[PDB]
Design a protein around this nucleic acid. Structure first.
Lengths: 85, 52, 49, 50, 61
RNA sequence: AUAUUGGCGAGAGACCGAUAGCGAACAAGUACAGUGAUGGAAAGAUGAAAAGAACUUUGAAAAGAGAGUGAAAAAGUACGUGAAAUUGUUGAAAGGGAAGGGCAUUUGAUCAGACA
RNA sequence: GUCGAAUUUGGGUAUAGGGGCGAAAGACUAAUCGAACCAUCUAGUAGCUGGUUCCUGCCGAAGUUUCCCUCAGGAUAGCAG
RNA sequence: CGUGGAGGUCAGUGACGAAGCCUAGACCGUAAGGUCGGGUCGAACGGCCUCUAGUGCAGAUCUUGGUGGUAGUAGCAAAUAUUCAAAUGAGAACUUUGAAGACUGAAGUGGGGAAAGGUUCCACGUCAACAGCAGUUGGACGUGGGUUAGUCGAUCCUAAGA
RNA sequence: GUGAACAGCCUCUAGUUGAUAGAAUAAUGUAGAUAAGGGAAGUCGGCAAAAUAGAUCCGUAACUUCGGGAUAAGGAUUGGC
RNA sequence: AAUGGAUUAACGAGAUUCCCACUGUCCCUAUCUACUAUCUAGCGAAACCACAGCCAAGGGAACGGGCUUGGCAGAAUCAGCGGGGAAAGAAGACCCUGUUGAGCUUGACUCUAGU
RNA sequence: GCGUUGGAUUGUUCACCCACUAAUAGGGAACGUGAGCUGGGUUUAGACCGUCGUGAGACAGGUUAGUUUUACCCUACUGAU
């Protein structure tokens, strides 16, 4: 009664795909994502979650802009163009 | 490393017949779950007297 | 192609020995499940029929 | 579900194009250690969770 | 190559193998001891009568 | 002057050598499990070089037998070396409700040294 | 057993852990409830149980004293190297 | 006595075969163990005087992996039930057509959908694994084809509530 | 079609003919039955089974909150043309 | 004696006693069918396991498969069976201990939101 | 050597009648016999009445409701090569 015949009634989703993190944790009745803090401005993270931050900190993505910052510093944030000596 | 071996959320099961008392990795589906942890004899556990 | 079609049959053999029904059957079994081994079931309400 | 959203239909298209075996010319390359497609998915076997 | 412990002249001897054959192991042992050491042309008449329920393979082990 | 388990660039070791070292030497926070928070593995080694076995023959086919490449197929994409539990075959021995062990010698098999 | 209503049921929505909800059984709250599950403090504490990895040589015990919220244990004396 | 690393030394041994492994073959030591021959194998490694430790396993209902006796045994017994010829194929109790026998008996084993699934729908090719027998068949494997709106929905409105 | 009926049994349209099969018919089982004479002596206990059953006509007690009890109990009957 | 008591129609998958009808419950067992079991082709697991399996007597952690003295003892095995193998489901639901807990109660100690 | 019963009241053995019979003798085998049966009674959680307690609850007590489920293994025994 509380087992395999009551598992047949499970066909109503509670969570759906989130826009900020794409994680399928955006709870529908609360309108808030339980993994990435959406729609609040601060991304949810805690210091008891140690593996929880290693899945979502920087460097795990593509880093479309940070991967060129350490290169542009080393030349000195120079402008202009090359010389053809 | 000072945290090597403790990156695990195991828990003891209890006193049944066909199992020991070493805390077992909870969860399911992965094949790591239901294995021993935190022991010096456990595969994937810390060593005795972690060197400093 | 006869070089390439034989290598798809060399590299299939390990899944066939474990009776994997494809390259999409990756059913990983638990070593020991909780509800078979962790319990003391005495006089009273018991954990199954 | 036959009344699906476009957000849902946009992800079935990516799941169809990832549903293929490995190309026969990648078997032949230099220092190929890639042998079989391992993220391959069946509908009967493993649900893809939306 | 790599046969078992054989004691014969390799000039006057042929051979065959089968690997990874999906049979039962306990059946293929007992049907191979029943034929061991026989004349080969008596062996092939013998196996054709096993399929017709005339002569039976004995099970020893 | 002082602080630093993060970031970036370097130099090291009386440290570990694939059940060890980070969870991860590998398309690893990947496969996969859970409604969710989160949980999270396994998996390195053909050869110097694919020269990855043309052709013939038996078979519906996988393969087998020949042949051939290589220093070696006792390295054939189940691939370096390949232990044990367990199993097959050949040869030897024993066996009247267990087996194995200690002292002692017969019978059988097998084996080292030395004669100047 | 009941079967026109204190009936049965879909979807929407409300209440969240010393809290909910209960025509009241300490019932139910995702196979978990006389206090859910997840991660951290955490390798929590045990006067209790189990285990503790090479060989030979020499010497070789105690279950008794007094004190302790002490009686499955300690401190002291004795015996031993 | 033995194991992993360190300093020293023997101008140590080695592709003319180092280490490892197997060995009812030999030798030494009371013993921990040391040494030699034969087999396989292919790239490093030992004696000694000393220095360091993550250093010696039969047991912990030990941890991970591997394999046995049990055993070709229990079993594969709910939902009334199959049969003949031909075609195809190497191979048919199971595939296709025909012949015949039956059932669900329209609160269906029929025809359409909502939730949920995501290509399973259809064709061509094709059977190593899967369908707890089988397989030439398939919701399987390989490559493709396919969903057409001014009127049906969504979009708009407000309910308990956010 | 039978019937008070969307009960049960049978058929037309539509759909399947799938669920490992062959050969034998010991015990003990599982599921379903029938028994001479007696009729609860069985047993903790009439558990289980059997018997009654639809419909029409006749008939219907104590008790009572006058509404019930009541299908009370008990009898006669049922085809075909 | 609203800690509620006496009474009582109707109703009850509530508890107990008897009477008619009825019948394998029984005297007392017999027989028939289907599907298993059984034999075959294909497929093919698990519990459990120190080592294993013939008994009497004696001693003995207080009731031996092994020890000691006797009775005996012939390969390989198939279908039944439920005496034993303290076979197996439960580091026991039972009873004592711990300077181990948790839930609940009250003029126990110490406090606290509130008022 | 052989034989010692059939019934009546409580879970009941304890305790005692009715009739037949030649006679209704006494005992043992883990007060024989639960991996043969029974769960009738023995022991959880539900609930009532009575006593005691300010209370949670315990009882001098009574009534009712209620889950342990192999055998294919070696031996024993009955049969079979």
């Amino acid at each position: 009664g509380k087992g395999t015949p009551s598992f047949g009634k499970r066909h109503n989703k509670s969570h759906t795909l989130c826009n900020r993190c794409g994680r399928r944790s955006f709870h529908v009745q609360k309108k808030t994502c339980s993994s990435c803090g959406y729609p609040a401005a601060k991304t949810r993270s805690y210091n008891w979650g140690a593996k929880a931050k290693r899945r979502h900190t920087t460097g795990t993505g593509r880093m479309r802009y940070l991967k060129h910052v350490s290169r542009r510093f080393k030349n000195g944030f120079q402008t202009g163009s090359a010389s053809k000596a | 490393s000072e945290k090597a071996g403790h990156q695990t959320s195991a828990e003891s099961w209890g006193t049944g017949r066909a199992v020991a008392r070493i805390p077992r990795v909870g969860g399911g589906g992965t094949g790591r779950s239901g294995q021993g942890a935190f022991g010096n004899m456990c595969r994937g556990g810390r060593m005795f007297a972690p060197t400093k | 192609r006869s070089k390439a079609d034989r290598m798809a049959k060399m590299e299939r053999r390990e899944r066939n020995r474990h009776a994997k029904q494809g390259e999409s059957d990756r059913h990983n079994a638990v070593s020991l499940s909780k509800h078979l081994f962790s319990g003391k079931r005495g006089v009273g309400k018991t954990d199954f029929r | 579900a036959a009344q699906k959203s476009f957000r849902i239909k946009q992800k079935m298209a990516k799941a169809k194009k990832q549903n293929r075996p490995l190309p026969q010319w990648i078997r032949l390359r230099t220092n190929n250690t890639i042998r079989y497609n391992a993220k391959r998915r069946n509908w009967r076997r493993t649900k893809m969770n939306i | 190559a790599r046969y078992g412990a054989t004691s014969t002249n390799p000039a006057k001897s042929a051979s065959a193998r089968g690997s990874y054959l999906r049979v039962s192991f306990k059946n293929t042992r007992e049907t191979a001891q029943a034929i061991n050491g026989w004349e080969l042309t008596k062996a092939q008449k013998y196996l054709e009568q096993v399929l017709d329920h005339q002569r039976a393979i004995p099970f020893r082990r």
